[PDB]
Write a structure and sequence with these properties.
This is part of a larger assembly, with 2 copies of chain A and 2 copies of chain B. Chain A is an alpha+beta fold. Chain A has 9 helices and 9 strands. In chain A, strands 1-4-5-9-8-7-6 form a 7-stranded mixed sheet, sandwiched between helices. In chain A, strands 2-3 form a two-stranded antiparallel ribbon. By secondary structure, chain B is α+β, with helices and mostly antiparallel strands. Chain B folds into 5 domains: 114 residues, OB fold (Dihydrolipoamide Acetyltransferase, E2P) (Beta Barrel), CATH 2.40.50; 191 residues, 3-Layer(bba) Sandwich (Phenylalanyl-tRNA Synthetase, Chain B, domain 3); 64 residues, Phenylalanyl-tRNA Synthetase, Chain B, domain 1 (2-Layer Sandwich), CATH 3.30.56; 223 residues, BirA Bifunctional Protein, domain 2, CATH 3.30.930; 93 residues, Alpha-Beta Plaits, CATH 3.30.70. Chain B is 26% helix and 25% strand. In chain B, strands 29-30-31-37-36-35-34 form a 7-stranded mixed sheet, with helices on both faces. In chain B, strands 3, 4, 5, 6, 11 and 12 form a 6-stranded antiparallel sheet that branches. In chain B, strands 14-17-20-21-22 form a 5-stranded mixed sheet. In chain B, helix 13 runs antiparallel to helix 17. The chains are: A alpha+beta, B alpha+beta. Chains B and C meet through helix 13, strand 39 and strand 40 of B and helix 1 of C. Chain A: It comes from Mycobacterium tuberculosis (strain ATCC 25618 / H37Rv). Chain A: It catalyses: tRNA(Phe) + L-phenylalanine + ATP = L-phenylalanyl-tRNA(Phe) + AMP + diphosphate + H(+). Chain A: Its cofactor is Mg(2+).
């Protein structure tokens, strides 16, 4: 009985190898999908600003001309208000359009809430550009607006630099160069220092910004002698292209499953 | 701590006469300033005939179970009723309390003349419980002779309009463990004048003509004051007046004799514990000293204590008198025949008493007050108060001898060091501008000495407040007296946060991802089952066996901490299965505890400075490794029964798919390689690598582990070490070619031992960029290909980046891929197709 | 967000739907002339003269992307989208200018809001080919209507509400 | 007909409560810190101003790691994680620590020996009790409704001074809006700052 159970052992143990299996076989019978990469970019932007005390606002894409332009200090015959640059709703002179930026959502927000107001508006916007590898007519934009006592350009840069660090790395900074927007005054363009790659750290045009124009404050019943404000807006397809190196915007919007899957689930 | 409102009121009333407040208000003022009122008991009400009676005759009723007593009771106006009573703690001649027919006792009980045990009973004799006067002990309430004549209204003699507040004092507030302390608190809340019931006007000093007893004190014991006074020739048969037995009863303390009762009373009145020694039972000099290794004392309760070299004692030439600060001993205990009493009024070392009382499990009324520091300035006043009162009750005399050791050299000022604080520091911290002088008046009210110096207060707290040692302590005083409710609700400016970290996000995403796929998270216990590793059959040197062990578990057989999460997972799986939930998949995400050496602890680092970076790294290195793990188990069905078909039982493949779910969630790529590792089945166990690092295992459990563990047949498991799965943040940029694709299906024959993923990798390597997708379809065995070979059919999708792929171009890539599998795993082409 | 995670995990690939409908999609579907979906807000200057109507339903853009994946050889697909539609309640009535030197009244806002079409958030999804792919486990399971009901139950579970399904034409 | 061939699972409800708490404080600019459950006595007690012979430090109230006097234990609150955080980061520090803690209570319907706790710590210039109430009330509103408030009643904790207990006004139900004991709070003790 010294060796009754020693081969009774190796009997049992080669039964276990008889039922062996190829552990490398595929097991995924419910293939994983993917949330779209722009939505996940929007997700990560949103969380970045939530984490700083901001809130997100939404609104209609078909939007009154009252809130797209007039409340945002576009003159009554501004070039953008022609059938060249903006989608208009029939019939002619019905003061209805596809919004060309998410700023109206911030006007709506400034009408509805008590001040101070620190608001992000992230949504689908519409310009009349033909769809090529660096332009889409249906694009997604992220705009901010902060109105409060004592706000200054320095706070604008502070928020800009915080935003940049979360989307690009702790090595990332912003610079601002004067420009012109009807919504803001002064107005600048924001370049970002994308150190992590591009094949060699270089400045890149990211978006625009500026102090909110006094006239936008009157058009929302806010005293400009008491409150100031800043705003910024960065286009998301723009940001995805140049950070990830995506030569062709068409891939972002054509809905090919091959574009999205490599980004993962987004869960 | 229990005490009754009448007494509390009496002592406040000395200095603000006519003070009185509803119990509801008092409860609210106590909470508002810091004292937790666990419970308010108004003394349960009585109606009708509940009067004092005198027992005039007792007849022991024989023949029944208990000893039963048919008692003639004088109830007033020469009226004698017979009454049945089961108790035995009373004799002929004793004042008892009777509820006669027509009475109603607390709890809605009406008394009626009831025939019982063979005689008529006109009511009954009450216990202090049945009256809702005090705690239920065995037998009825007996009043001290002369408390009341028979016929007297019970409600009046018992004082049942009183209310007993039951408080849970916090350890910083020991001084409130007495009528003295609470009285002062109430006087402070209500801005009343306060007469200290331990002041000389209220306890005139007794004379001091010579030492009351020889005493040596080893001062490293921690004793800060040790006073003795004797009372001689007391009537040993005297009992305590009704008023004094009563307030003890309401406060939770059972009366015994005046010697003991007076000390318990004065303990409650002033907070200074006291003890009474039978002086004639003391042999020679009284000694305060540490105990020696192995020494022993028998305490009052006649129970032998095993002492510890840090327990301070009181000894004499003969034996031990007292475990100092905790409980006196038998050797000098007051007894029935004690005529001459020596009264101990000591101040022990708080930490000493705490240590000793916890070790012996003797949380005496004395101990709990000494733990929280007793006011050393009032020992002689409490000793004198306690001596006069004893002589006054039991009729002896108070010798003018007095011993009063106050340290070497003697301390003559017990005030703490002064604390130094800005006049408006309370205002800052509260965020409230208190009216001018508030802060100074409140610090005066608690009894401190406040002196002004521009904008800077100098505050000497009083001797009963050893908790007042920095300005923070002074702030809490001001703030609690004004009320915390007056502090506003101001959101602070919080800075730009960075939000969640990558690892925090990864755990959330692993949780969503598993939960969606059907797994139910459990909260794993860290305490392993008994002998789980003996159940698994782990070798004795199996690293998982090296467990950090808990030294006081709630289950003596389960003291080891988990080095692996499968035990707790498997335990929950067993629970669901035993309740009929046989088709389960559980998962957990929690740390394990893997120690690197034998439990080495680092010694104390001073708390007046911050530790060095090195002292941190040493502290960190002293603790075991504690990596985050994720793990999961599955059993029964994985797809349930339905109209679609019978369902799919859990199989090892499902545990590999759990790996792939966690990996997809973690945005990393894994490889599975065969492995032998318990508790897994050797032929169905995979090791998981990210790159070339092992991150854990997955597969079906060993059938013999399953069996010994009472687990379901076929149970699968998976555990991954998250700390071993590196951060990843891909910035993908997928090449999305629109040109048409060519679909070809190739079948390869290989040795059965070759893993399918090897053949796939070789095919991908040989085919190059044109191969867009490869996927395993079929796996076929049969005789005609060889008993030890197998046939893998792969589905290949080729696509060019710039052109419409020809179909020769494709077969070029196919041929190239077939050749690579030939060179790397010896594949033979079976055939191909489209 | 939770509807997106929940669908994506179950195998769906989000697309960004175009709001500009295909030409005559509703004539393709055979919708009656009075079918509310036909009442579309029309764009006056599209980048495609034949595609000027805004989507009252997200299936057109979803179906368009499904066609694209299928024509490129990706026959086993499940797409989904989460975006607003544009359903107008009258003929395009625009409100005239309001002075910008003051803020508009609460009433001028409600009138401006009522002038715009209804724009509710929709979620939608399409499926085709296989739903479980081929493998060693067996030949796979082609998409069936039951899979679209299960998409409903996924969105409902994500929305923490209970749904009932009733037959309908 | 039923269509669900992949039954839905569930993240545990405590973890989702922790999730919702975490997001509430992230949204206010705070950050979360984590740390070991087996933890030096240096950081559990001494750094948190527990005296050297405090009752909680006996084998009654705290799980200790063998062998006797090895200054190692299962942490009885997440505060050490905040000490570790105050050592490692630059001030100001607004930190949440949410994790598994361990006390020796027997498991009955209102106590568990293994429980999960949420602790905050905010250190900065000019902080006051009023900021404590501000954060408390914000926290309450997110977890209970816009109708929810807190009240504070003095108490004692070695970690804080002054110290209070926080009751919350749970209007939304309980069968009839009443105050409920929620947790404790206080100003952080000077001695924790020196340490």
């Amino acid at each position: 009985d010294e060796r009754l159970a020693t081969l009774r052992a190796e009997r049992d143990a080669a039964v276990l190898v008889a039922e062996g299996i190829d552990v490398t076989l595929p097991s995924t019978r419910v293939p994983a999908g993917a949330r779209h990469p722009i939505i996940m970019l929007a997700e990560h932007v949103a969380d970045t600003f939530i984490a700083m005390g901001w809130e997100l606002a939404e609104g209609p894409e078909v939007e009154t001309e009252q809130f797209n332009f007039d409340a945002l200090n576009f003159p009554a015959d501004h070039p953008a208000r022609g059938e060249q640059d903006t989608f208009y709703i029939a019939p002619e002179d019905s003061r209805q359009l596809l919004r060309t930026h998410t700023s109206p959502v911030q006007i709506r927000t400034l009408l509805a809430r008590e001040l101070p107001v620190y608001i992000i508006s992230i949504g689908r916007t519409f310009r009349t550009d033909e769809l090529d590898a660096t332009h889409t007519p249906i694009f997604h934009q992220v705009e901010g607006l902060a109105v409060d006592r004592g706000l200054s350009m320095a706070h604008l840069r502070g928020t800009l630099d915080a935003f940049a660090r979360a989307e690009f790395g702790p090595s990332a900074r912003t610079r601002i160069r004067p420009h012109f927007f009807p919504f803001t005054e002064p107005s600048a363009e924001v370049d970002v220092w994308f150190a992590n790659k591009i094949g060699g750290a270089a400045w890149v045009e990211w978006g625009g910004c500026g102090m909110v124009h006094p006239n936008v404050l009157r058009a929302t019943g806010i005293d400009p002698d008491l409150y100031s404000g800043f705003a910024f807006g960065m286009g998301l397809e723009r940001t995805l292209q140049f950070r990830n190196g995506i030569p062709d915007m068409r891939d972002m919007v054509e809905g090919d499953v091959r574009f999205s899957l490599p980004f993962g689930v987004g869960a | 701590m229990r005490l009754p409102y009448s007494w509390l009121r009496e002592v406040v009333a000395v200095g603000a006469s006519g003070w009185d407040v509803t119990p509801g208000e008092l409860e609210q003022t106590l909470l508002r300033i810091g004292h937790e009122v666990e419970e308010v008991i108004p003394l349960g009400p009585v109606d009708g005939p509940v009067t004092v009676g005198r027992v005039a005759d007792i007849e022991e009723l024989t023949g029944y179970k208990k000893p039963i007593r048919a008692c003639a009771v004088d109830i007033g106006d020469r009226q004698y009723r017979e009454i049945i009573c089961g108790a035995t703690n009373f004799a002929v001649g004793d004042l008892v309390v009777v509820a006669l027919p027509g009475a109603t006792l607390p709890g809605g009980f009406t008394i009626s003349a009831r025939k019982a045990y063979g005689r008529n009973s006109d009511g009954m004799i009450c216990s202090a419980a049945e009256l809702n006067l005090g705690a239920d002990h065995s037998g009825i309430l007996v009043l001290p002779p002369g408390a009341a004549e028979p016929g007297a209204d019970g409600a009046g003699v018992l004082g049942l309009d009183d209310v007993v507040f039951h408080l849970a004092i916090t350890p910083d507030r020991g001084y409130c463990m007495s009528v003295r302390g609470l009285a002062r608190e109430l006087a402070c809340a209500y801005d009343l004048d306060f007469v200290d019931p331990a002041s000389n006007s209220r306890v005139p000093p007794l004379p001091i003509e010579g030492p009351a007893w020889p005493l040596t004190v080893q001062p490293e014991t921690g004793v800060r004051r040790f006073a003795l006074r004797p009372v001689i020739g007391i009537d040993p048969a005297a009992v305590s007046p009704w008023w004094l037995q009563r307030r003890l009863l309401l406060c939770g303390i059972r009366a015994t004799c005046p010697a003991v009762d007076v000390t318990n009373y004065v303990m409650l009145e002033l907070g200074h514990p006291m003890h009474a020694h039978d002086r004639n039972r003391i042999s020679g000099t009284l000694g305060v000293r540490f105990a020696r290794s192995g020494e022993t004392a028998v305490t009052l309760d006649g129970i032998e204590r095993k002492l510890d070299t840090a327990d301070v004692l009181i000894v004499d030439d003969a034996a031990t008198a007292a475990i100092g600060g905790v409980m006196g001993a038998a050797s000098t205990e007051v007894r029935a025949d004690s005529t001459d009493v020596l009264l101990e009024a000591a101040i022990w070392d708080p930490a000493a008493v705490s240590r000793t009382q916890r070790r012996l499990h003797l949380p005496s009324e004395a101990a709990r007050r000494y733990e929280r520091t007793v006011d050393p300035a009032i020992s002689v006043a409490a000793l004198d108060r306690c001596a006069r009162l004893l002589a006054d009750i039991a009729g002896g005399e108070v010798s003018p001898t007095l011993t009063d050791w106050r340290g070497d050299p003697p301390c003559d000022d017990w005030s703490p060091p002064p604390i130094r604080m800005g006049v408006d520091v309370p205002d800052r911290i509260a965020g409230v501008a208190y009216p001018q002088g508030t802060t100074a008046r409140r610090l005066a009210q608690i009894g401190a000495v406040v002196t002004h110096d521009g904008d800077t207060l100098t505050v000497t707290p009083p001797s009963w407040r050893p908790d007042l040692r920095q300005p923070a302590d002074l702030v809490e005083e001001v703030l609690r007296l004004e009320g915390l409710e007056v502090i506003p609700s101001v959101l602070p400016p919080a800075p730009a946060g960075r939000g969640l970290t990558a690892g925090q996000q990864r755990r959330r995403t692993i949780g969503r991802s598993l939960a969606l796929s059907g797994y139910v998270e459990i909260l794993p216990t860290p305490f392993l089952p008994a002998g789980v590793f003996d159940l698994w059959g782990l070798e004795a040197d199996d690293s998982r066996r090296m467990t950090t062990r808990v030294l006081n578990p709630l289950e003596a057989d389960r003291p080891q901490l988990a080095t692996t999460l499968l035990p707790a997972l498997l335990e929950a799986l067993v629970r669901n299965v035993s309740r009929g939930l046989v088709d389960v998949a559980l998962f957990a995400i929690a740390q394990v505890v893997q120690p690197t050496e034998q439990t080495r602890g680092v010694g104390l680092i001073p708390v007046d400075r911050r530790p060095t970076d090195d002292e941190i790294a040493m502290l960190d290195a002293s603790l075991p490794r504690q990596p985050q793990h994720v793990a999961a188990v599955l059993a029964g069905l994985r797809e349930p029964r339905g109209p679609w078909g019978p369902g799919r039982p859990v199989e090892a493949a499902d545990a590999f798919e759990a790996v792939r779910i966690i990996a997809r969630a973690s945005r990393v790529d894994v490889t599975l390689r065969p492995a032998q590792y318990l508790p897994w089945h050797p032929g169905r166990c995979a090791q998981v690598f990210v790159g070339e690092s092992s991150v854990g295992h997955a597969g079906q459990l060993h059938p013999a582990v399953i069996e010994r563990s009472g687990l379901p047949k076929g149970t699968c498991a998976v555990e991954l070490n998250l700390d071993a799965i590196p951060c990843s943040a891909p910035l993908p940029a997928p090449r999305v070619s629109p040109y048409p694709a060519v679909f070809q299906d190739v079948s390869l024959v290989v040795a059965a031992d070759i893993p399918a993923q090897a053949v796939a990798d070789a095919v991908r390597a040989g085919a190059g960029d044109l191969l867009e997708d490869i996927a395993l379809f079929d796996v076929f065995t049969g005789p005609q290909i060889g008993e030890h070979r197998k046939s893998l059919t792969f589905a290949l999708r080729f696509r060019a980046p710039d052109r419409t792929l020809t179909e020769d171009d494709a077969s070029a890539a196919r041929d190239a891929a077939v050749q690579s599998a030939a060179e790397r795993v010896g594949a033979v082409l079976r055939g191909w197709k489209l």
